[PDB]
Amino acid sequence: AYPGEELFTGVVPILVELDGDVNGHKFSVSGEGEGDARTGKLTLKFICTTGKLPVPWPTLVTTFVQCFSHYPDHMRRHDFFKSAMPEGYRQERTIVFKDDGNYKTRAEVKFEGDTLANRIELVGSDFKEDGWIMGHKLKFNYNSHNVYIMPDKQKNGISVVFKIRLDLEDGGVLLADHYQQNVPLGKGPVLLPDPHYLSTQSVLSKDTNEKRDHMVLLEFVTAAGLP
Amino acid sequence: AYPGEELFTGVVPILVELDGDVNGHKFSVSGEGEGDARTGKLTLKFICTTGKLPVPWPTLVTTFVQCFSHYPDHMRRHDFFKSAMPEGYRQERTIVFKDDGNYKTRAEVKFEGDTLANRIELVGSDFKEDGWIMGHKLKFNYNSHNVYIMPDKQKNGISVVFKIRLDLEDGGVLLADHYQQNVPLGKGPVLLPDPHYLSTQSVLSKDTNEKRDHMVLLEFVTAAGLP
Amino acid sequence: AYPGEELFTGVVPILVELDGDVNGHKFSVSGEGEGDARTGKLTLKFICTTGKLPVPWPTLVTTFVQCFSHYPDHMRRHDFFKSAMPEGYRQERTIVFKDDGNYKTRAEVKFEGDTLANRIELVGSDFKEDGWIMGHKLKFNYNSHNVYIMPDKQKNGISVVFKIRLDLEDGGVLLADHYQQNVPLGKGPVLLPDPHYLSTQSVLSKDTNEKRDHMVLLEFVTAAGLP
Amino acid sequence: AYPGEELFTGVVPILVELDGDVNGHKFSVSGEGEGDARTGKLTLKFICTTGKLPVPWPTLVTTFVQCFSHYPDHMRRHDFFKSAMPEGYRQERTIVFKDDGNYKTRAEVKFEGDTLANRIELVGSDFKEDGWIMGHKLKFNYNSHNVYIMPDKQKNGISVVFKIRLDLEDGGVLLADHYQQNVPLGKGPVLLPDPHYLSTQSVLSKDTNEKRDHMVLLEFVTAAGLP
Numbered sequence: 034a035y036p037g038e039e040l041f042t043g044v045v046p047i048l049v050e051l052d053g054d055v056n057g058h059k060f061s062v063s064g065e066g067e068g069d070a071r072t073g074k075l076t077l078k079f080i081c082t083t084g085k086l087p088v089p090w091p092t093l094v095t096t097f098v099q100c101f102s103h104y105p106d107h108m109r110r111h112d113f114f115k116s117a118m119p120e121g122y123r124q125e126r127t128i129v130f131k132d133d134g135n136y137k138t139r140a141e142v143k144f145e146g147d148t149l150a151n152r153i154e155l156v157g158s159d160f161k162e163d164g165w166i167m168g169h170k171l172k173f174n175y176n177s178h179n180v181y182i183m184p185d186k187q188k189n190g191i192s193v194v195f196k197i198r199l200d201l202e203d204g205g206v207l208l209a210d211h212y213q214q215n216v217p218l219g220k221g222p223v224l225l226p227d228p229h230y231l232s233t234q235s236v237l238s239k240d241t242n243e244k245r246d247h248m249v250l251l252e253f254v255t256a257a258g259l260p
Numbered sequence: 261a262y263p264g265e266e267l268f269t270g271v272v273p274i275l276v277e278l279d280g281d282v283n284g285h286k287f288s289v290s291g292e293g294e295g296d297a298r299t300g301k302l303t304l305k306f307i308c309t310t311g312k313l314p315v316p317w318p319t320l321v322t323t324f325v326q327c328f329s330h331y332p333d334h335m336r337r338h339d340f341f342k343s344a345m346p347e348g349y350r351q352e353r354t355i356v357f358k359d360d361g362n363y364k365t366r367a368e369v370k371f372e373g374d375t376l377a378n379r380i381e382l383v384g385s386d387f388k389e390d391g392w393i394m395g396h397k398l399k400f401n402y403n404s405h406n407v408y409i410m411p412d413k414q415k416n417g418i419s420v421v422f423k424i425r426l427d428l429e430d431g432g433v434l435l436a437d438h439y440q441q442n443v444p445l446g447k448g449p450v451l452l453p454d455p456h457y458l459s460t461q462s463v464l465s466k467d468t469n470e471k472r473d474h475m476v477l478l479e480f481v482t483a484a485g486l487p
Numbered sequence: 488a489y490p491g492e493e494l495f496t497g498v499v500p501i502l503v504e505l506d507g508d509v510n511g512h513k514f515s516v517s518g519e520g521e522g523d524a525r526t527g528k529l530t531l532k533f534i535c536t537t538g539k540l541p542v543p544w545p546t547l548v549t550t551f552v553q554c555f556s557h558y559p560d561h562m563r564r565h566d567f568f569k570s571a572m573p574e575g576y577r578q579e580r581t582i583v584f585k586d587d588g589n590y591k592t593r594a595e596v597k598f599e600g601d602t603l604a605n606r607i608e609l610v611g612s613d614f615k616e617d618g619w620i621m622g623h624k625l626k627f628n629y630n631s632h633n634v635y636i637m638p639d640k641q642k643n644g645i646s647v648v649f650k651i652r653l654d655l656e657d658g659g660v661l662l663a664d665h666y667q668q669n670v671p672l673g674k675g676p677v678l679l680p681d682p683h684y685l686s687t688q689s690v691l692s693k694d695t696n697e698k699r700d701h702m703v704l705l706e707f708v709t710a711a712g713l714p
Numbered sequence: 715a716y717p718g719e720e721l722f723t724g725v726v727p728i729l730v731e732l733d734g735d736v737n738g739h740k741f742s743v744s745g746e747g748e749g750d751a752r753t754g755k756l757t758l759k760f761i762c763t764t765g766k767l768p769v770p771w772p773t774l775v776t777t778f779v780q781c782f783s784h785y786p787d788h789m790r791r792h793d794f795f796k797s798a799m800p801e802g803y804r805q806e807r808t809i810v811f812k813d814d815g816n817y818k819t820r821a822e823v824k825f826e827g828d829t830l831a832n833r834i835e836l837v838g839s840d841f842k843e844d845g846w847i848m849g850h851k852l853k854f855n856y857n858s859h860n861v862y863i864m865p866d867k868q869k870n871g872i873s874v875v876f877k878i879r880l881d882l883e884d885g886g887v888l889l890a891d892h893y894q895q896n897v898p899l900g901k902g903p904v905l906l907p908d909p910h911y912l913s914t915q916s917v918l919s920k921d922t923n924e925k926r927d928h929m930v931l932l933e934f935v936t937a938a939g940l941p
Binding site: 354405412413414419422457486 | 581633635637638639640641646648649650666668681682684713714
Binding site: 074175253 | 299330402404461463
């Protein structure tokens with residue numbers, strides 16, 4: 034297999050660092066945790082190093098390491114995330130919130146020693162001051178959803194798009210469309226996958242022994258084929 | 261690769277049946293769902309078959325299948341719950357609510373065909389009818405907390421002790437001490453674990469399409485070591 | 488303040504008496520020393536009054552007064568051992584030496600006047616004459632390990648299990664598993680602690696002016712909580 | 715509470731730097747660890763920087779921090795070592811090895827930031843290159859032995875005298891008389907103690923992961939009054 038696969042035979046530490054800017058409200062978030070590609074388990078904890086988060090925590094869940102998705106034996110040849118390791122890949126993402134603003138993220142997912150780092154730069158604009166983001170908070174859906182992937186041959190990478198359902202405090206729903214391009218960092222050949230998807234489930238919680246603004250995230254991801 | 265773990269290589273159906281008697285108020289609960297030991301995932305739905313539940317649903321979460329906890333590779337020799345399968349184990353518990361009544365539960369967790377069954381007999385007493393549990397709304401801790409386990413060599417089983425923080429409606433916190441003793445149902449050899457604990461996480465929801473008194477539970481449990 | 492903490496504000500003399508029986512060899516040990524709960528310090532000298540000890544001295548350290556452990560301010564409510572004083576408690580233990588023999592101990596730790604007395608009975612069996620324990624000269628690890636404690640609500644006492652590491656003459660390691668049960672002797676109320684542990688450190692030494700088979704013991708024990 | 719005592723209420727890092735010259739053989743030792751005066755516990759690791767130590771490690775322990783001796787409550791007015799802190803004290807010694815050479819040491823024990831550093835200079839002479847010390851046939855005494863202390867009114871410090879037994883591989887015992895003088899470095903008032911002694915207990919071992927010439931030291935010291 035690829036020299037990137039056996040870098041995930043067991044538990045791998047994760048470091049997260051986010052430098053965002055939403056309508057002028059600058060902020061920084063640091064994250065830390067572990068990941069197990071054998072089961073697709075992810076246990077991460079994030080903290081707003083600048084104090085309070087100006088945007089809702091669940092809106093940054095997707096931005097905050099898809100290389101820890103579990104790929105079954107019959108589909109390991111479609112794992113582009115682990116393929117581009119240890120040099121890693123670049124993750125660009127346009128998040129469009131319906132009837133609201135949009136995010137634009139630039140991430141660098143790579144290995145730094147024995148740790149997996151996710152250094153991201155996020156920009157936000159066109160969010161209303163009384164919109165569903167800069168105003169009333171929301172919550173991330175704890176149900177399984179699908180994240181679809183196809184290869185991008187001309188870019189030697191993969192295309193990834195998916196929808197996010199955010200439950201509003203007033204019983205409503207704010208759909209967030211994610212468009213994502215991934216490009217390898219190293220020059221070595223990567224796996225060009227067949228169109229497939231990932232079954233993703235994330236549970237949000239807090240840490241009772243934490244005084245700062247934070248979020249605890251438990252994520253299970255499993256890849257699945259498309260006939 | 262101890263015997264009993266083979267019964268949890270995939271999704272296993274779960275049947276839950278409870279018969280309760282809290283302060284003379286008799287009731288029955290039927291529950292169904294499934295569990296995945298590879299991820300420690302737990303999805304169940306419980307229905308009050310006698311009408312309205314006289315106690316808050318969150319006070320009955322723990323009573324309502326720890327054999328679906330995920331034991332990492334280096335800790336599989338500590339899995340007493342799966343070692344008792346398929347003959348199963350008996351779960352007796354004493355749940356003391358601070359400054360209020362107490363529960364006494366007798367359960368039989370075993371395999372019925374391909375379905376993991378959990379038949380429980382619950383008895384409550386000394387509950388104040390005007391306190392904050394009986395006839396009032398409660399909220400489960402929802403965040404991660406620890407469930408401590410130790411071997412009981414005299415009874416050839418395990419002792420399980422843990423705490424639970426329930427959230428009252430006025431903002432106050434009610435604490436429910438749990439005292440638990442598991443013993444195997446058959447004469448086959450079981451696993452005597454070292455002191456360890458389980459990291460538990462639950463999410464409570466409501467079925468919009470269900471008219472009877474009901475509870476939907478999502479739960480994630482992971483075993484962890486004590487040095 | 489339960490009426491047991493005041494009995495340990497200063498230095499308290501210790502009496503130890505043990506009648507042992509291993510592979511037919513009947514032996515006796517007398518011990519004396521002091522104990523200070525403010526620091527967890529234990530100074531004890533044991534002497535085999537029946538001649539030579541037929542078992543290695545390190546295998547009897549745990550059998551040879553956990554009421555002298557230091558419990559910090561935030562842990563005083565978990566000190567079961569002190570709450571059973573002055574009437575004291577009973578300490579039954581099953582020690583399992585891996586791939587070798589087993590110890591069965593029964594002790595009554597209680598106050599006899601102004602000194603705390605520990606009177607034990609030991610029965611050993613299934614020890615190989617060429618076993619790792621038999622032959623003596625064993626080595627007790629001077630590093631600190633953890634002795635986990637959980638409440639036994641049914642018996643109105645506590646359950647205690649831990650592991651000790653015995654260094655062998657061959658450079659290897661003998662693991663002795665300990666399974667302990669504590670119940671109160673008197674009829675008053677006792678402390679029912681939360682799950683916690685005790686970091687215990689001990690050092691074996693000798694007395695150059697002592698001609699009989701003996702051992703000098705130095706031990707520090709401090710209580711610590713579990714999340 | 716005496717002014718210098720507040721600096722030892724918790725664990726204190728320790729630095730040790732020794733330059734030696736025994737019979738023209740030059741060497742330097744670096745040492746590090748921590749001290750806990752609540753229990754009189756010491757754990758230090760020393761590394762010979764210049765390569766192979768030309769004298770045996772057991773001969774250098776005492777040269778290798780009596781300010782970490784535990785002084786019981788009602789004997790605290792006798793702690794000159796702590797009362798010299800933070801400015802520290804000078805510690806000069808003459809170690810006569812019977813029918814062999816001698817050590818001359820000069821130590822400046824003081825606080826350097828939050829770390830108590832013991833920087834020593836050692837000179838050894840008149841040692842027999844074919845005797846029992848230079849050939850490295852020595853073992854340490856792990857049993858408790860006494861260290862006698864007395865005030866020095868004129869020098870505003872203390873004199874310290876004690877004996878030490880060293881075990882040779884032929885079965886013989888080598889006595890090493892120590893003559894010690896301690897004088898404060900600062901101009902603050904120090905405590906002139908009464909005649910008393912320290913009960914010292916030491917244990918030497920080896921680091922299995924260390925390739926350089928080294929010694930791990932564990933020490934327990936406790937002061938005691940003289941009638």
